[PDB]
From Swiss-Prot:
Residues of the full protein shown: 700 to 1040 of 1040
Tissues in which the UniProt entry reports expression: Expressed in brain, heart, kidney, liver, pancreas, placenta and skeletal muscle.
Disulfide bonds: none
Signal sequence coordinates: none
Known outcome of mutating D139N: Impaired nuclear focus formation, reduced interaction with PIAS and increased sensitivity to cisplatin
Role, per record: May be required for DNA interstrand cross-link repair. Also required for checkpoint mediated cell cycle arrest in early prophase in response to mitotic spindle poisons. Possesses beta-lactamase activity, catalyzing the hydrolysis of penicillin G and nitrocefin. Exhibits no activity towards other beta-lactam antibiotic classes including cephalosporins (cefotaxime) and carbapenems (imipenem).
Transmembrane segments: none
Cellular localisation: Nucleus
Protein's recorded name: DNA cross-link repair 1A protein
Induction: During mitosis. The mRNA encoding this protein contains an internal ribosome entry site (IRES) in its 5'-UTR. This 5'-UTR generally suppresses translation while specifically promoting expression during mitosis, when cap-dependent translation may be impaired.
Family membership noted in the UniProt record: Belongs to the DNA repair metallo-beta-lactamase (DRMBL) family.
Summary of subunit composition and partner proteins: Binds constitutively to TP53BP1. Binds CDC27, which is itself a component of the anaphase promoting complex (APC). Binds PIAS1.
Length: 341
């Protein structure tokens, strides 16, 4: 059964609610983005209208085989009427195709559902500038002040400089980058661009990337692993055993691996600067964990909410424990008392 924080009151709509069977009263199912915890339940046998971005709808059709007649892609930044209700899709600054959804309820209430997002000051000049928001369904993944991490631009500068130094010192080094979902494509694309290579990957991952509307993508990726010196592997293989095994398969072309594991936050963030990050090394294999986040830091989240000034907040992450719920409610009240709304 579908939980309350996935239902939009005063509508027939649900958000990210495909794992509960037929939800009573739902006339349109929205999908914020193509991550498995959110799409869980969708397949070629789905027969209700799904509303989403163009990119999400390319993934639903090619990867999950949902039939075309049930996929309703909406353009971004554009007022659309769905089943008698005005909606807008906004870029969420999460993975490719990820959106926030503005709902203009028939009674005058305005609701923002963030989906998953990484808050940014540029959202203060989107279509959100133009009217009041009563209710905020908020991605609270990192809603605690210990969650600090650098900008995505600082993390990519670190990765590119690290990879270019290593391969210039040793032209026989291979670079490997872990992946298990869409998102974080800048890591492997930025490193392949500085090295003058395409990114090599499996047929299944090439297929996924071909759905993402990235400009000039045919110039950037390949399934011919032998022609490439940046390889993508599943995240589970980014360990010393997995990497040793991969290096064997390369037929003596390479004699060293430098590997990247983009994580979210880890507790090594509480003490060390991005500048000072060091790898784990065994022999001719070195592994860097890099804190590339596609979710808001605590500070980015707090700035967004203090600007928006919602009347009510409904968290969508960390909702399962009383301690997490009480912690998040305390910070929301701090924010509100500090800013005066
Ligand atoms: Ni996500």
């Amino acid at each position: 059964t579908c939980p309350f924080y996935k239902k939009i009151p005063g509508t027939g709509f649900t958000v990210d609610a495909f794992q509960y069977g037929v939800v009573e009263g739902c006339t349109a199912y929205f999908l914020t983005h193509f991550h498995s915890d959110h799409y869980a339940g969708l397949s070629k046998h789905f027969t209700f209208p799904v509303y989403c971005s163009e990119i999400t709808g390319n993934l639903l059709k090619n990867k999950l085989h949902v039939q075309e007649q049930y996929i309703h892609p909406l353009p971004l930044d554009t007022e659309c009427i769905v089943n008698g209700v005005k909606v807008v899709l906004l870029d969420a600054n999460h993975c490719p195709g990820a959106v926030m959804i503005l709902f203009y309820l028939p009674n005058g209430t305005v609701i923002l559902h963030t989906g998953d997002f990484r808050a940014d000051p540029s959202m203060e000049r989107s279509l959100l500038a133009d009217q009041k928001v009563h209710m905020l369904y908020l991605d609270t993944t990192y809603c605690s002040p210990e969650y600090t991490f650098p900008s995505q631009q600082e993390v990519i500068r670190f990765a590119i400089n690290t990879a270019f130094e290593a391969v210039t010192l040793n032209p026989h080094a291979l670079v490997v980058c872990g992946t298990y979902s869409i998102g974080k494509e800048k890591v492997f694309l930025a490193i392949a661009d500085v090295l003058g290579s395409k990114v090599g990957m499996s047929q299944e991952k090439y297929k996924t990337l071909q759905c993402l509307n990235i400009p000039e993508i045919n110039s950037l990726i390949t399934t011919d692993m032998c022609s490439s010196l940046v390889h993508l592997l599943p995240m589970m293989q980014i360990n010393f055993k997995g990497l040793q095994s991969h290096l064997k398969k390369c037929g003596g072309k390479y004699n060293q691996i430098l590997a990247f594991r983009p994580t979210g936050w880890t507790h090594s963030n509480k003490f060390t600067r991005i500048a000072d990050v060091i790898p784990q090394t065994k022999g001719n294999i070195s592994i860097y964990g890099i804190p590339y986040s596609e979710h808001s830091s605590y500070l980015e989240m707090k700035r967004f909410v203090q600007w928006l000034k919602p009347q009510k907040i409904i968290p969508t992450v960390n909702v399962g424990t009383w301690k997490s719920r009480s912690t998040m409610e305390k910070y929301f009240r701090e924010w509100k008392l500090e800013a005066g709304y």
